[PDB]
Amino acid sequence: LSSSLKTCYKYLNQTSRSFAAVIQALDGEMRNAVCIFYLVLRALDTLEDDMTISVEKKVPLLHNFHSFLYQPDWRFMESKEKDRQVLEDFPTISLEFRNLAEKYQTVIADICRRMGIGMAEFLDKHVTSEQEWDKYCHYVAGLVGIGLSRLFSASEFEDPLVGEDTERANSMGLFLQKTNIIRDYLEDQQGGREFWPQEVWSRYVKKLGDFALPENIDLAVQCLNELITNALHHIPDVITYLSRLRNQSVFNFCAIPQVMAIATLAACYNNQQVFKGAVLIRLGQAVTLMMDATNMPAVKAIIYQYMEEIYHRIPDSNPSSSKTRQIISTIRTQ
Amino acid sequence: LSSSLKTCYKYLNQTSRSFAAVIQALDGEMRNAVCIFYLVLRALDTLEDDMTISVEKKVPLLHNFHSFLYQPDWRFMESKEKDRQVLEDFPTISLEFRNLAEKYQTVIADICRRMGIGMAEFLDKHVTSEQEWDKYCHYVAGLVGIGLSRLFSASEFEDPLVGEDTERANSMGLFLQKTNIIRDYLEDQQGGREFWPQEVWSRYVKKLGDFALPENIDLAVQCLNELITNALHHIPDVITYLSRLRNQSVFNFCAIPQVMAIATLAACYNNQQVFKGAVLIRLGQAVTLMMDATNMPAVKAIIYQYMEEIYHRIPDSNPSSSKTRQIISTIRTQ
Amino acid sequence: LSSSLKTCYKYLNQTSRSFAAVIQALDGEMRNAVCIFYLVLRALDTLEDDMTISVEKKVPLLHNFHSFLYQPDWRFMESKEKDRQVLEDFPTISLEFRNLAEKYQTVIADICRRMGIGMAEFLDKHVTSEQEWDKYCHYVAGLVGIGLSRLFSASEFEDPLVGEDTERANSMGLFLQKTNIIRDYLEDQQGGREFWPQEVWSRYVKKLGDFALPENIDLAVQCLNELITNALHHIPDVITYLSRLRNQSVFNFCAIPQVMAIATLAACYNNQQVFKGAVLIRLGQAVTLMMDATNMPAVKAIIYQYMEEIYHRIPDSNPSSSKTRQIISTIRTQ
Amino acid sequence: LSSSLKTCYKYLNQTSRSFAAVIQALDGEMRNAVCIFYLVLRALDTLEDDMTISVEKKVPLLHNFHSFLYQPDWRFMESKEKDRQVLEDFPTISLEFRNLAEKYQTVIADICRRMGIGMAEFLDKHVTSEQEWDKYCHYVAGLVGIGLSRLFSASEFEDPLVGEDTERANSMGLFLQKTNIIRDYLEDQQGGREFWPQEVWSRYVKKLGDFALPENIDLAVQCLNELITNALHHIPDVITYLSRLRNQSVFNFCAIPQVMAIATLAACYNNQQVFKGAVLIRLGQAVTLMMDATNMPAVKAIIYQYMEEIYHRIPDSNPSSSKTRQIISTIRTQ
Amino acid sequence: LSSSLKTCYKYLNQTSRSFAAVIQALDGEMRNAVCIFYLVLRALDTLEDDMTISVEKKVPLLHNFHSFLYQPDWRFMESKEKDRQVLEDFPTISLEFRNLAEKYQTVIADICRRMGIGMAEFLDKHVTSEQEWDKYCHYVAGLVGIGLSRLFSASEFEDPLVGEDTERANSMGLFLQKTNIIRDYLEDQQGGREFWPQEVWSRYVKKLGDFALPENIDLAVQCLNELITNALHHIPDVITYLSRLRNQSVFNFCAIPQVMAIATLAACYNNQQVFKGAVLIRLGQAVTLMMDATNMPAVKAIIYQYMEEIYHRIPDSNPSSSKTRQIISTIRTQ
Amino acid sequence: LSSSLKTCYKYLNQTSRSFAAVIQALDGEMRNAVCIFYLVLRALDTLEDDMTISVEKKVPLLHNFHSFLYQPDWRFMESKEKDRQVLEDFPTISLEFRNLAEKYQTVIADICRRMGIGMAEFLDKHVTSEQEWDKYCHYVAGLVGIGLSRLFSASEFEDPLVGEDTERANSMGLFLQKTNIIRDYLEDQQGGREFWPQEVWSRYVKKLGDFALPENIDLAVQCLNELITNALHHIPDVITYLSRLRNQSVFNFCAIPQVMAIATLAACYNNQQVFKGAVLIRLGQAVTLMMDATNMPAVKAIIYQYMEEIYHRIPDSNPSSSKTRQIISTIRTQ
Numbered sequence A, B, C, D, E, F: 001l002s003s004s005l006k007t008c009y010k011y012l013n014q015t016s017r018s019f020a021a022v023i024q025a026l027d028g029e030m031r032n033a034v035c036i037f038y039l040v041l042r043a044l045d046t047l048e049d050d051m052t053i054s055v056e057k058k059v060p061l062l063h064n065f066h067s068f069l070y071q072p073d074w075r076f077m078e079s080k081e082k083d084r085q086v087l088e089d090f091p092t093i094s095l096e097f098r099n100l101a102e103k104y105q106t107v108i109a110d111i112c113r114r115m116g117i118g119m120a121e122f123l124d125k126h127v128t129s130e131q132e133w134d135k136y137c138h139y140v141a142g143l144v145g146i147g148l149s150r151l152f153s154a155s156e157f158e159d160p161l162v163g164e165d166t167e168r169a170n171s172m173g174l175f176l177q178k179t180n181i182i183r184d185y186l187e188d189q190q191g192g193r194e195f196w197p198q199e200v201w202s203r204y205v206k207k208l209g210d211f212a213l214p215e216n217i218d219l220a221v222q223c224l225n226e227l228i229t230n231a232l233h234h235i236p237d238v239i240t241y242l243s244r245l246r247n248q249s250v251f252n253f254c255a256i257p258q259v260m261a262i263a264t265l266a267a268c269y270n271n272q273q274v275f276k277g278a279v280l281i282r283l284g285q286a287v288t289l290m291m292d293a294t295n296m297p298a299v300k301a302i303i304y305q306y307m308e309e310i311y312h313r314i315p316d317s318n319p320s321s322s323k324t325r326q327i328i329s330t331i332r333t334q
């Protein structure tokens, strides 16, 4: 019916290459709720990304973004990013946001608020310690997981526990984000963006940018393996999280990205290609050509199998080899 | 046990290369029920297609086909079509038809009678209006969806509603027929068969066969896109229909062909190759390699993903661009 | 937590490259139960396989393997087989075996006692009649199926009927073993092993090894087809068995190996390559890209598709063509 | 739909005072199957009864009754027994028999064939040994249990094991028949029918008819208790049988008669009234006012509470005192 | 917790002396939903029943009754009916109504609204045609069923299909009212209320009140029978409605009243005592002493039993006999 | 197969004319575990009740009874109670006790330990406060509830929460014990035993035994009514506890004794017969004539029905009317 809701879905498909379809597949109220949540986070992300907006203007935009959701006429016309249409026509998105049931608005507004604060905080600094890496990921990805989970429970399509266990939801985001950060080393390096924790790579080279130099390829891969080992620690929580889902549409929505992340990590482990270009998320065995990420047992199997793909490739000369075998060993046994 | 039932499945596999496996997977009595229904339909279809049979001779066979089901010895030995074995050894198929529970015989016979009338109606006239295109599609496919739906309900594997909502059942059939007609343009041309609505193609060229001429490709790809736009209007009903199924074997049965159809229209949209030869069904994104057509949310996700693939490519140029986008946008917001 | 248990899962992944993931995906208590049962069966299998162990020393080990499970200190240091470590560190395995709830212990020890006797019975003789082929397969695989089925029922995750139907459970194992025995012909020849039934192959050549000589290739393919035709007879039972399963993790665990087995038999049929190396398992139509092995209907469809793949390749001149079409016909129709 | 099927259910109600409701309450296919099976057996049984048909003419009819199922016009018009309508209009019944799926037809036909043989076999000879008592009951009731079990499995509403375990199915029937035989002692006598095994009652009196003589009322009660004791041996199997049932409608169908029989056996145990008229069905304690035979645990509890009503009233001075306690103790400990 | 909720349950047990216990057995959120829903419906009906209330004063109350649920202070102190307590203390009930989740409020509200209109629409006219009888019934009972079905679905305890199938829900309602009306003939006449359809009783006596004169008793028993025959046509839908339910508490809640109604109709069929006083409900056969109205097969059995209790007594004389036998034969055969 | 286990069950049926049935009806591992537990409790209880056993000799026996379970030869010969046979042949029972899985031995031993201690503590004192009444019941029955609840969980046939929540298991025992204590006032008094709390009965008469005197019948009924009101407070726990059971056999075992208790209190309420003899437990309404204590909803409906029976008989002048109405109102509302 609503032309503004029709427009919101036009942007979802425009700005969401993949997620768009699965989001539209969600049951009842979660559909519109997640669609708007995606769009509002999409806009916020657009502002953050836009480098033609001075820090002076950007900090206040990120900080107050959440309240823009309540100003019927607010819009932004100076963006030069590809997805800026959601900023220039924000009143439409913001208008549908205010149509959602109050309980959903509470969640979305709150996530935007905290996310804006966090993003503004990393506008000047880079990631230093592994602790800061968790904090960054938490702001841009963890909170998303917390928000979605809180939306799932608020709608009652999932148990209240899903939205209460913020640590598990946060792990879903961190895993996705750390995996992407690891995979996009080069693409980011060429974009002047740095995300790998300084306290980790500084143990290998002088500047993060050095991993692109062939003489460093070895060190680059060693660093690579250590970050991937770090990301692997989130698997227990991811499994716990997905095993609590009772709604099929919610499950497809959450499981698919997680499965895709493990496969990526698997494809990246001890792989020099990560520093030459984007890597080949590939095939799988005939025991994964037998299942899709649509039921938990199948997902556990898919995740465990990718675990071993990594375990089979752990070279003894790797500095983290011992730690990698260890965390994987722990994940199996639970 | 019965050797004639075995013969029947032999014919099923011969005539339904792809789909026999899905049919054979149906639970309990739906299995033979649909197998036989498929075979009697194939026979009726062969009689209709056979061009060596004059119209005056053919009409009585179509009108009385439903009754031949009760003539133990009736068989047809003069067809020259590829699937003529089903007409030549029809006594074997009608034998098994007569072994089905009476409540199923009634459904299959009723559909056969009506299909015959309609098939007769169209032996002399070509399809003119879009309204007539629905009628023709109703007779050769829409009725199959209504037939199958009442077998489902009568068998009790599905809710009584499935069989009662004839509009949605009819839509399932209409969506496949139109997709096939659209796809088979060239093959129907070189076979002297015209199915595209006259009131549509007669706005682009003087004679349907003209789209086969390289100098008209552009006008052809336009008419093509107007028909696909037409077809897209059934998706809301296809989704509603599928969302009511509860039996797994019946779900794979109904959902797989609808998904294959949407994928086919996606490939054909704004595609000149439709007029040069056979179109190959395209791969897919990474969020379609994760799921299959076995659960409702996954199928919706799939349908939507193909929706966007078409939407993306809608040239503002096209005379239908506005209507194409509008029907899709509408499918996305329900 | 338990390091000896963590060690068992290390051995599980070490000795089962392709199935550890599925086993680890089993619900609750079945996970450790099946893990241990696998390690225990792996050890026993390794003893039978080792030819550096004389028959007179092996018969006792096989007969009393079941009691070693209760001898905290028993291990075996003379194996020179690839999986010798499960034997060398058996105390860790038996330790975790004695931690399993009694209901599982009883079943596992029971299976080991009978498997041992059966394995020892065949150390001297080669398989003669087809009836003998089933006996051997019953000893090394059918009992396993029977064992697992009793574990499923004991855990309450599967109905008591699963474990009580030993006939069907036994067939699950036979279908799997015959497929592998058939596939590994060459590998077993070069290994000094002869499993193909003599009552059968002796009708084609003078000595089983003759099938390796390029001049007999044709007679080899004939025997190959006779044996494959033989194995197909278990399919009905496999289907019935799987259809009784109600737990997802159990279903996935039971269906995958069978599907893989069908795929294998389909690839080997009338295939010369069986006698010149290993056979490559191929993709398979688009209707198997639409579903996976996680639901009963989908599994039937995959099994039927593969059946047809074999059907279309039956050479009329094959001395078993009739019997092959016959058994495939029955499977299609039931 | 068909008035013939409508007519079949009219007769079902006319001839089955008690069980037409339960049969009509069976899910899907079992309904018509059991309905026809019942009518057919009633017709048969109505011939065996009719003393107005001469041995010479009755014997062949019993022997060939199964064959008339395939003769559209076969009927019988000289019967004078109460239920004669089924024979007079058997064509209606046979028509509906020929309309059931072949798998039900085969089951029913085979049972009638075998039952007709036994019936004829026991027209001349009375029951001699206890071995003969089992034989007689197997032919008139055991087979009914085997047949029904095979129908239940062929319909897939029940597990394959239900139809395969003919011993347990046979017991269901034997228990019901012996129970009734024992209780209808007198009624039998006036009708001149003698069913109590000779080898058992012969060790008490001169002619079975004696027990009716008020003076022998004491010896009659010892024989009564020995038969009841014999029957009791069937309970273990009854429990095993009912324990496999999974369909609620089949369970109600099977459990009830069994429960009503045990209650009967208990009402007749050590009761002199057996020889003075029809003995009635006693209510129960307060632990039976709480349960109904709709779940196995309750049926079990009920059976045990009846095993007790009998156990308590067991006279130490009865010849079978020890054997009765022996069997009841076994039933309790399983 | 709530003291006003406690009061609502005190009112529930007052107005629903028998059924209050079943409503209270409902799972989760349905408990309060149905409890309140029952109370507001009692209130509304109390208003429609009260005759000291002028037509033009009542019509507005019936039409706006639904809006009163949202006015904290609405109550009615001028009703002098027995349940007036729910009208004088409506604020306690409305307060608790306004406490139910909105999804439930919507339904109840919508139902009271449509029901109000309908009731008003009948305050003046009597029931003319049988069709009008369905409208009246649809207005006072049918909507109630539709409402309850939507609550069941909204609560997610029942499948969405339960709520969607409004026609079956309507019948559940109609079978109940038509039964009550038919049996309350006398009581209603002494109260100057007429509900039997005139187009039906007109064909018997000159004025509905004539059935009170003992001279017309026979014409009365004939009208009675033609009406019960009318009501029975609803049993097929009832059975279908009940068969779809998968929640135990909802089943008990829906089945019990329906079974009771069929017991009442059998008690009233061809019974003169309907015009002398109220008809009592009694025993039943021995196959009912073994089953309760808590499972579908047991409920069918019950229904089928009563179907027979009636058939058994359809006098050849009754002018409806033919039609009474038709519907019962059909109910037995589906 | 064990002759000793065979003797244990003979004793079970001997000592528990009721409970034995539902116990023998328990699934798998719980069957013997409960039979044994019931037997050790009966023995322990047979000592405590033996008045021919001096307090000095008794205390030791009670404190060390749990230790006799591990002493193969222990047996008491000087008992004069009816069940003395279980103490004299204790080795039999102690042997079977030792034959149980450790996890079951642990529960039964700990409970027998905690019980001997309490029974000894009350050997000389009487029940003063209502607090002490809860304590006395906790020792003789509450713990039995906690015992059973833990066996259920250990055996895993029930959720771990069942043995966890010791409070609800305690309430299950208190309810039965109090109901019994209340019903057995006279029989107890005549046997010189007193269990009613002094703090309660002292407010009516100078001595508990006085309620036995006709002149005190009214005072007796009032105190009776106050105690019944006390017991009614355990019903919410009784419901919560029953609502968590998933195993049918366990549910039957637990619900029936509870429903029997509720039925008994309802029949005892405001009833003079309590003090003149034992009370005969009447059936109920027709909507109890429609269910059985085998499913939660039914059980709830039954519990609630009886609550209303009590509610309707409450005398206004009764000193506990307010308290009784209060609690009934609460049970209704939860």
Ligand SMILES: CCCCCCCCCC[n+]1ccn(CC(O)(P(=O)([O-])O)P(=O)(O)O)c1
Pocket: E015, E016, E017, E018, E019, E034, E037, E038, E041, E144, E148, E257
């Ligand atoms: C909002 C849900 C409405 C459920 C309505 C169906 C409840 C079934 C019983 C309805 N009702 C009407 C009359 N009565 C019967 C009685 O007159 P009542 O005193 O009202 O229980 P009784 O059975 O003679 O005690 C009960």
